[PDB]
Design a protein. Structure first.
Lengths: 252, 59, 252, 59, 252
């Protein structure tokens, strides 16, 4: 059957035995920039082995009452190897991605997640006219967390699961590449997200390209004898990466 | 819009059987519902939606 | 594989994911009356959309100690839609059937049913020389129930699981179209029963054509933490229906 | 009929292993038995069966 | 799929629904002695129906703390039917084998066995300069048992699970035909072992050809409500048997 899937990217291989499928974005596979869309003129560096590989981010736990997580994803890989270095030393970066989210549970557990990859997820602040700090929209590989109530903190992102941060209806949030990790059948979820942007090659620090949102709909309900700690592990890998405009280090 | 001349149908879900579950598993569960349209779905007249409720300008 | 089965009849569709098979009677698929067997001469009405559809009867529970059920089946659909109306207004009716019995259970449950469709199941009375009332052989979609002991009620059907009502040996009751709902593999049971009768077109109130008998052999045994109420749901659908001799309403 | 000159065989069922069952499941279960005949089964002489035990007529 | 396997040998048939595979020795299927390797000259008796059949040995239990078992296998079938008789009355015997080991467990159990068929497993004694009795290397179909500690009994086999009796490293004991009965997937284990010996036809009482060793690595761990007694049943069947040198009975 087609439940056993393997993915080889460079020197890191994910083998899963209860996958679902691979959602290829909006049908378009990742590709390098063809020169009908060329803007800049100097030769870019395409590493293709030390960059197109799986990088593991931090793992978060899912209790009975957890509300959600979000990761910005040109920023959470700021300091993950030579993708991080070649992010720092350049000025323009273009790359696809390949999301994989590990989360396993036995047959006596129930619950369902939702893995949506929202482009340009511009979030509203907790107060109406307050400036968000940079350390609350993202924290790198450290995951942020939704709050189910009406959050009212200072310099903080508006945490509400029934608005998804942007003020959209969170039930209608499935127009994007989404998969459902229902814990009765599936071991993981795979999203191959191509690079959607209005400019051909963009910077990778000023711009937050997209946001991976995991929001639980069916809560982690289980008996009084099972294992409580059920983690969630996320590991992504860029695709077709290239870098334009080498300059001195830093960002300011 | 809500009117009397065109009424559609009444979805009603029913237990054909109960939920038989073995021991050391929770009793209650969660069903979800999705909605979409088939191959021959259509819309005809534009208008404004009744969800836009503003008072003044957004300066 | 062939565990996923779908049945479409009119405007009602049964989709099961752990079926067993479809037992087609004694090999013969339902058919309209070909005119080599024609007896009456006026044109019959074949509705074919408002009649050949799934009608759901009442649901009964199966505890640890339940003994059985029986339904007469030209009579339990007396008042189920236009099959019931076209039963009432006519005089002769011919139709096949398609039995489907829903009953689900988890993997930590055990037990086994037996779904036998016995033609002409003429039952003996509780006392020897007593006349059975009409409201004890059938109650419409309200199911009757066997009693495991020697039943000795007045005006009542002889309720004994080791005789099957007719006085036959109940272990030998598998010569008919039968399926076994063993709860470890199967979700349902399907019997496509053609119309077996000695006359080509018969009345549908005076005659009880057959009896669907569900008799548990392996009792519903389970732990001290599982869900007690495990229902049994039965839904049938006539096939190739036709009706002869329209007359004024009623039956007397 | 029961006689000495023709005896057939002695079915005997045996535990090859025990029944290993995990927790929160009942211990005891039920095996059933079925019987039938193969392609070359035969019978030869008619007679009356010893199961018919009546006394008078059925008026 | 290939999980359902059937084996017919004479008048005894093993049907398993969660097998793994059939390990055919070192690739060589059992065969009669071709006359390029012929040593003796009188005609041998090849019964082929009353000998090549499955013989069931004794069943042993596996608690949480059991350490191992070993069977010598030209000797444990000393008194199993006409294989035992034709062992006794002859002088030279040549036969292949076909090991099958039944051991079943539910899904809420865990553990893993190891079924290795070691040729010429010459075992060391408990004391250094002591003569082993015949009733401790083998006991027929009565299984011997390893001891996990340093065994120090008199006239006894050196029982230690971390030496496998021969003083070899027991982790390195997988060079032979081995299968793993991990209790989460498999119902049994099948080893078709051909006859490996330095002489073409050997006696079957003086020589112990090989030793079947079952040594648990993952202990039988389970909950506080499951069934404790989980047996282990072993049933083998010789193949391509022949017997040379008929003489008077006995062995001395």
């Amino acid at each position: 059957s087609d439940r056993v899937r393997s993915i080889t990217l460079g020197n890191s291989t994910i083998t899963t035995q209860e996958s679902a499928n691979v959602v290829v974005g909006y049908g378009v596979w990742p590709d390098y920039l063809s020169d009908e869309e060329a803007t800049a003129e100097d030769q870019p560096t395409q590493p293709d082995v030390a960059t197109c590989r799986f990088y593991t981010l931090d793992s978060v736990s899912w209790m009975k009452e957890s509300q959600g997580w979000w990761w910005k994803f040109p920023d959470a890989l700021r300091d993950m190897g030579l993708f991080g270095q070649n992010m720092q030393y350049h000025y323009l970066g273009r790359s696809g991605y390949t999301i994989h989210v590990q989360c396993n549970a036995s047959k006596f557990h129930q619950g369902c997640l939702l893995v949506v990859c929202v482009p340009e997820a511009e979030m509203g602040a907790a107060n109406i006219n307050e400036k968000i700090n940079r350390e609350h929209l993202s924290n790198g590989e450290v995951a942020n967390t939704f709050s189910g109530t009406k959050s009212s903190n200072t310099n903080d992102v508006q945490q509400a699961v029934f608005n998804a941060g942007m003020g959209v209806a969170v039930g209608n949030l499935t127009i994007f590449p989404h998969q459902w990790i229902n814990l009765r059948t599936n071991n993981c979820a795979t999203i191959v997200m191509p690079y959607i942007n209005s400019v051909p090659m963009d910077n990778m620090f000023r711009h937050y390209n997209f946001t991976l949102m995991i929001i639980p709909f069916a809560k982690l309900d289980y008996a009084a004898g099972s294992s409580t700690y059920i983690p969630i592990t996320v590991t992504v890998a860029p695709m077709c990466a290239e870098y334009n405009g080498l300059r001195l280090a830093g960002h300011q | 819009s809500k009117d009397i001349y065109t009424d559609a149908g009444f979805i009603t879900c029913w237990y054909q059987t109960s939920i038989v579950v073995p021991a050391e598993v929770q009793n209650q569960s969660v069903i979800l519902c999705f909605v979409s349209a088939c191959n021959d779905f259509s819309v005809r007249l534009l208008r404004d939606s009744p969800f836009v409720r503003q008072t003044a300008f957004y300066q």
